[PDB]
Write a protein that holds these residues in place. Sequence first.
Motif, PDB file in Angstrom:
ATOM      1  N   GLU A 627       0.837  -1.191   0.000  1.00 48.44           N
ATOM      2  CA  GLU A 627       0.000   0.000   0.000  1.00 48.44           C
ATOM      3  C   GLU A 627       0.875   1.246   0.000  1.00 48.44           C
ATOM      4  N   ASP A 631       0.593   3.988  -2.865  1.00 45.65           N
ATOM      5  CA  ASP A 631       0.222   5.359  -2.604  1.00 45.65           C
ATOM      6  C   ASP A 631       1.191   6.283  -3.332  1.00 45.65           C
ATOM      7  N   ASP A 698      -7.492   1.148   0.392  1.00 44.42           N
ATOM      8  CA  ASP A 698      -6.145   0.702   0.738  1.00 44.42           C
ATOM      9  C   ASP A 698      -5.661  -0.542   0.002  1.00 44.42           C
ATOM     10  N   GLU A 701      -4.507   0.419  -3.631  1.00 45.54           N
ATOM     11  CA  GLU A 701      -3.129   0.898  -3.689  1.00 45.54           C
ATOM     12  C   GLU A 701      -2.196  -0.293  -3.594  1.00 45.54           C
TER      13      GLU A 701
HETATM   14 MN   LIG Z   1      -4.702   4.343   1.751  1.00 41.49          MN
END
Ligand SMILES: [Mn+2]
Length: 732
Positions: A627, A631, A698, A701
């Motif tokens: 993640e 991101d 989440d 990502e």
């Molecule tokens: Mn996130």
Amino acid sequence: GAMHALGHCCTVVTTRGPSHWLLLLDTHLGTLPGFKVSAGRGLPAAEVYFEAGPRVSLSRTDATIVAVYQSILFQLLGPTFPASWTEIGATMPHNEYTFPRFISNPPQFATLAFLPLLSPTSPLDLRALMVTAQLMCDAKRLSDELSASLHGRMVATPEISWSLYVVLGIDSTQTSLSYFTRANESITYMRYYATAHNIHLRAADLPLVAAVRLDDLKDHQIPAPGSDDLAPKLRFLPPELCLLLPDEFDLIRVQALQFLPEIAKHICDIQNTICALDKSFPDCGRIGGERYFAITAGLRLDQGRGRGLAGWRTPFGPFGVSHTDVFQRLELLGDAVLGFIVTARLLCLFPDASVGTLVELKMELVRNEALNYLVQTLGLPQLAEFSNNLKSKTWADMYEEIVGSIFTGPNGIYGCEEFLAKTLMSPEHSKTACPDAVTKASKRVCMGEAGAHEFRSLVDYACEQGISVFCSSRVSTMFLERLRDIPAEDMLDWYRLGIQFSHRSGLSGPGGVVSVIDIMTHLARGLWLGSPGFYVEQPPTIPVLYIYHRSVQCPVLYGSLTTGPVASKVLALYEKILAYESSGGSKHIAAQTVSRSLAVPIPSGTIPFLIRLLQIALTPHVYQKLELLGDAFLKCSLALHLHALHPTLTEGALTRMRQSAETNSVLGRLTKRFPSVVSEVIIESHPKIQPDSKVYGDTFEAILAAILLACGEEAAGAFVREHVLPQVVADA
Ligand SMILES: [Mn+2]
Ligand SMILES: [Mn+2]
Ligand SMILES: [Mn+2]
Ligand SMILES: [Mn+2]
Ligand SMILES: [Mn+2]
Ligand SMILES: [Mn+2]
Ligand SMILES: [Mn+2]
Ligand SMILES: [Mn+2]
Ligand SMILES: [Mn+2]
Ligand SMILES: [Mn+2]
Ligand SMILES: [Mn+2]
Ligand SMILES: [Mn+2]
């Protein structure tokens, strides 16, 4: 002079219209950045646009045929201009350069010749030049040849500095013999020229001419056959002192030509800028005109001063975007790529570290206080110039701008990465006798004849001396700690690699300086861009190799997967991760389903590994770092896709836009567009979770990272512009 002739289609525009020319340069300056010129020196505000053409060759004769037309021009320009573009340019006062404080005397000086063009598409006619030049040569005197056929036609006064005027019509109301007046003085025309210019008219009885001096005419339009909208500047001259220019030399043509010294000056400006600050500014890959504007944008933090940036002229990037805006939208982008690089490389440098600490380290290096230091060390502030009339401006910004500029240059990410490695780590980041065992251990290393018991001594004394090679203190501290975990027999590979980088970057010979800080740094670099992967703490170690998928490879460092010292390490992980026994049930089923639900063509034979990286993205506690990486990349990706999509927009616009499509909710919904099998595994791994939960955004990502990691960058990039880009809401 010879074939050597790069074509450029000029277009000088003004209130009245466009004037096209074919610029021949004896040098390669890529594309030339246009620029507009303010109102002044007799001639009014205008704009000049350039655009590459064919590499037109010339037979020596045709070269002499060009010479002719040129003299014509130099004569129409007057005595205030030396018949030589190259000279007109090299006579420029310093105040008229983009960097008046850094004037260099370059080896060569481009040679330029301007030709007339009817349309931006019209070919080059060397015969049309003769006709033209002939016309000029056989130009009668107005007193040899009605006031409706001369209206608007151009004509200069050879015996009178060749000043230019625009015929408005013959004023029979009077003749050269007539009178005109001044405060306390009335004189006849004939007499005046006899008294002043000291010229003796012959056809003094000829009907005078009523025209407007090109200066005064600035941009004013021309009335009809004397309706004379504004006629106070209007003047009268002897038809004999008047040499009517052929139709071709029509106002547009003429006046437009008054902006050629400036195009020359432009070329002179550029060239000077190039070799004066070229080796003083982070190399981007660009050259000629683009390297110029690139330097201006990164060094001219303030806007032009009324008159202009470099004289009266002000260069604009593609789409007429100011150098200011460019800095604005290159930093914004440099900030993101820089952020992504750091996130990736730190993950591998500290495969055991936690996101929390991985985020603290990031800032520790991306921090303003830090970058503001790398910029000081780059000696950029001195070159930075601006009238302190600009408020939240920061040195640090320059770093991100350069990063954003390297990326968009022909060197790209491979460039930012290099720029990054050098700067963030350096022997100049620590302070400063030493035992004997160390000194001897230093040399032995300098020539590989050093082993495990010689590096440890080097790391420990560098461990108990507070040696730091990162612009950060904790990062450095944290660095040395890692080395402790690294088996001595593995350090020579990191060294020979670090020392390898220092070399192809021209910042070091084939061998190190022979110091301990020096030694430590070469490891740092090598370990920075060398480490294979990371752990997803309590299930193996994920390998970061999305770089071997890039269309252009750099074996010198990274090497190949077909096998190096470093290369072998990553591949080792790669396989060990395939060597895992897929527990195939649903997480594997969802993993499979996501694979084909990408609507994006990923490189072949990359599937099996991708699937692995997907299950991991799906299982709870494990998708933590994925993640983190996603991101970062997403932030970089979007910025890019927008940057390209909106060439005229600035920071704010670009910011608000991408942030709009980054919120969890947005990303989460995307995660749901996958065939339920996915949504199902989620709820499966998370009891009583909600549609608005975080995990939804989440895991997306997490996925994104899985694609990058396994399928390479661009693959993920297409993933972003296909699924996420569409969600960006417009400011409007
Ligand atoms: Mn996130
Ligand atoms: Mn000078
Ligand atoms: Mn005399
Ligand atoms: Mn740009
Ligand atoms: Mn670690
Ligand atoms: Mn800060
Ligand atoms: Mn700002
Ligand atoms: Mn900033
Ligand atoms: Mn060398
Ligand atoms: Mn994000
Ligand atoms: Mn745009
Ligand atoms: Mn939960």
